[PDB]
Amino acid sequence: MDQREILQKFLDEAQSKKITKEEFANEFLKLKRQSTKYKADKTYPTTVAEKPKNIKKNRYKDILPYDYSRVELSLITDEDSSYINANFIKGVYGPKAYIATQGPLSTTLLDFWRMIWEYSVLIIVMACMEYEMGKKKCERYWAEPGEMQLEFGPFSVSCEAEKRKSDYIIRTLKVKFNSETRTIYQFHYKNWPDHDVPSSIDPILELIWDVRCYQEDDSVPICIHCSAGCGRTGVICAIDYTWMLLKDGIIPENFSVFSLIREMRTQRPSLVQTQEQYELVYNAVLELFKRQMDVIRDKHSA
């Protein structure tokens, strides 16, 4: 089939059978069942995360990077200095399109910047507040205007500019290491789509649009984090991945949101964590299919 026919079949199916809350809950339960089975089968061990020297580097004891996809550090390497709570996530064309990580701890701030530097990351997407429900969710790894340089071991971080949009801030950060200076763009998203408001997905799509304005391609990983680096991080990953498929005309004939999320959850645990998050991905993906069909319809007018 061609892309138009694949997209139209997804749209026709969505239109002709609306997915109910019970259906979403049943779907998410199968995803959780797969995780139970994989845990019992020892498919994806987390041995490195579990080492005593690495326990204090994990924000949440239940969220440990699978060994096979963990991001290994080597920049200025102590014997466990290789460990960070982060996993590579494959993009549409190959591995390591994304790094999905936790919000750094006071003890992992240096490790965070080592990762960013070592992997030549340009873009950081933060999808949490510093404080949520009154608890601290992420330590300050960024600089703000007027603060000059913050220092994290040998990394000096300053902020040249902030662009304040409706629901997020784009910080232009300058990072210095060993007399080299790099520009990093941090997108700090400080809202989240509301389950009870269909139009509330628009800002998340706008966030990802802007991100892809700054890096269109997959030459270096994009770092995405929230507090745990699962939940909101997975939503963003999944929507972006799908939009890349759409934009490049490579949606597979077997495309499903269920298979997409299945695939993600095998690369970092709980990468999309809740039924509500699963639903947001579905709704966002459907909107993106509609938008790509419009692109096709206008190109076909020639």
Please state whether 257 falls in left (phi above 0), alpha (psi between -120 and 50) or beta. Answer: alpha
Any known ligand binding at 213? no
Nearest one of 233, 195, 257 to 63, comparing CA atoms: 233
Q: Say what the resolution is, in angstroms.
A: 1.9
Q: Which residue has the tokens 């999808």?
A: 127
193 neighbors 280 (Cβ within 8 angstroms) = yes
Provide CB contacts within 8 A for 26, sequence distance 6+. Answer: none
Q: Give helix 275-300 / helix 3-16 axis angle, nearest 10°.
A: 130
The Cα–Cα gap between 56 and 197 comes to 39
Q: Which residue has the tokens 């500019």?
A: 161
* Angstrom distances, CA of residue 100 to CA of 24, 86, 87, 154, 237: 24, 5, 5, 24, 8
Provide CB contacts within 8 A for 167, sequence distance 6+. Answer: 189, 190, 191, 203, 206, 207
CA atoms within 13 A on the CB side of 92: 19
Q: Which residue has the tokens 């030459």?
A: 219
**Burial (CB count <10 Å: 0-12, 13-18, 19+), residue 140:** middle
Any known ligand binding at 226? yes
Q: How far is CA 137 from the centre of its chain?
A: 16
Q: How far is CA 74 from the centre of its chain?
A: 23
The Cα–Cα gap between 253 and 80 comes to 44
The Cα–Cα gap between 278 and 19 comes to 12
Nearest one of 271, 270, 199, 269 to 240, comparing CA atoms: 271
Give the catalytic positions in this structure: 226
Please state whether 223 falls in left (phi above 0), alpha (psi between -120 and 50) or beta. Answer: beta
Q: How was it solved?
A: X-ray
Provide CB contacts within 8 A for 223, sequence distance 6+. Answer: 98, 99, 101, 115, 116, 121, 123, 124, 125
The Cα–Cα gap between 166 and 42 comes to 44
Provide CB contacts within 8 A for 272, sequence distance 6+. Answer: 230, 231, 234, 235, 238, 261, 264, 265, 278, 281
Any known ligand binding at 273? yes
80 neighbors 54 (Cβ within 8 angstroms) = yes
The number of domains in the chain is 1
Partners of 156 in the β-ladder: 151, 176
Any known ligand binding at 231? yes
Q: Which amino acid is at 30?
A: K
The pair of structure tokens assigned to 112 is: 């965070």
Any known ligand binding at 70? no
Long-range contact pairs involving 67-72 (C-beta distance under 8 Å, separation at least 24) = 68/44, 69/267, 69/268, 71/99, 71/101, 71/115, 71/119
Query: Domain of 138?
Result: 1-302
CATH number, residue 207:
3.90.190.10
CA atoms within 13 A on the CB side of 94: 5
Q: Which amino acid is at 174?
A: K
The Cα–Cα gap between 254 and 90 comes to 18
For every residue of the chain, which 3-state class applies, written as one string?
Answer: CCHHHHHHHHHHHHHHCCCCHHHHHHHHHHHHHHHHHHHHCCCCCCHHHHCHHHHCCCCCCCCCCCHHHEEECCCCCCCCCCEEEEEEECCCCCCCCEEEECCCCHHHHHHHHHHHHHCCCCEEEECCCCEECCEECCCCCCCCCCCCCEEECCEEEEEEEEEECCCEEEEEEEEEECCEEEEEEEEEECCCCCCCCHHHHHHHHHHHHHHHHHCCCCCCCEEEECCCCCCHHHHHHHHHHHHHHHHCCCCCCCCCHHHHHHHHHCCCCCCCCCHHHHHHHHHHHHHHHHHHHHHHHHHHCC
184 neighbors 175 (Cβ within 8 angstroms) = yes
Provide CB contacts within 8 A for 164, sequence distance 6+. Answer: none
Provide CB contacts within 8 A for 210, sequence distance 6+. Answer: 165, 170, 187
φ/ψ of residue 86, rounded to 5: -165, 150
42 neighbors 84 (Cβ within 8 angstroms) = no
Any known ligand binding at 134? no
244 neighbors 287 (Cβ within 8 angstroms) = no
